[PDB]
Amino acid sequence: DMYIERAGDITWEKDAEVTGNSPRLDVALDESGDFSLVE
Amino acid sequence: GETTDGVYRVMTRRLLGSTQVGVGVMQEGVFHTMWHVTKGAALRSGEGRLDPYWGDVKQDLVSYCGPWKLDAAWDGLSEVQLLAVPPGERAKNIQTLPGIFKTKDGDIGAVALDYPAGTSGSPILDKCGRVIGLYGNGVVIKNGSYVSAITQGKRE
Ligand SMILES: CCCNC(=O)[C@H](Nc1ccc2c(c1)CNC2)c1cc(Cl)cc2[nH]ncc12
């Protein structure tokens, strides 16, 4: 049996870790909700 | 029991000890999470019991206690923040600029941050503090790095 526990508030923290790239990917979503690359 | 607006951990005791299987957002008395996390199973909040209300395996989304409430969208220009709640670790806002998932049905944003599976369902926020999607459903690209879509549900 699953259960939930609070972890925090939904607030934008000014001056937080700025990391990560922004890629443009061609993908496909199937009936089962799974994404896959298209090349 | 606890109906407070905020980000929550989805935990199970069926495996060894206490295990975090995902994350979720509570808003307007409704719990929103990714479908692969619970598989549409009932949740517990203290002595209170959350039951599924709406779900869809293709969108990979599920709402409890009521219909989907999150409706803000990425403007395709601004930097967003991932409110990552990793298994056994403190909630940590990670600001990033999203990419794009070009699909046959239109484009959707994508956050290129790498986190353990137990982080699935972590909200993605805009500058006002509005949930524009959930992080947890994506694909693994050429160099092994993870790219999740910015998954948002439809409000009624
Ligand atoms: C290999 C890329 C696809 N995998 C994911 O997206 C993972 N979740 C997920 C698992 C099962 C199903 C879905 C999603 C939807 N359809 C069923 C997943 C999320 C995260 Cl946040 C970190 C992960 N590490 N390894 C898998 C992983």
CB B26 within 8 A of CB B48: no
Closest residue in A to B57 (Cα) is: A33
**Counting runs of H as helices and runs of E as strands, what totals does chain A give?**
0, 4
Sheet holding B122-125, edge to edge: A17-18, B92-96, B80-84, B122-125, B131-135
CB distance B141 to ligand 1 below 6 Å = no
CA-nearest of B32, B15, B143, B140 to B87 is: B15
Compute the radius of gyration of chain A from its Cα atoms.
17
CB distance B136 to ligand 1 below 6 Å = yes
**What is the Å distance from ligand 1's center to B137 Cα?**
5
Architecture field, domain B80-149: Beta Barrel (2.40)
Architecture field, domain B6-64: Beta Barrel (2.40)
Domain parsing of chain B, residue ranges = 6-64, 80-149
CA distance B45 to B31: 11
The coordinates were experimentally obtained by: X-ray
Resolution of this structure in Å: 2.8
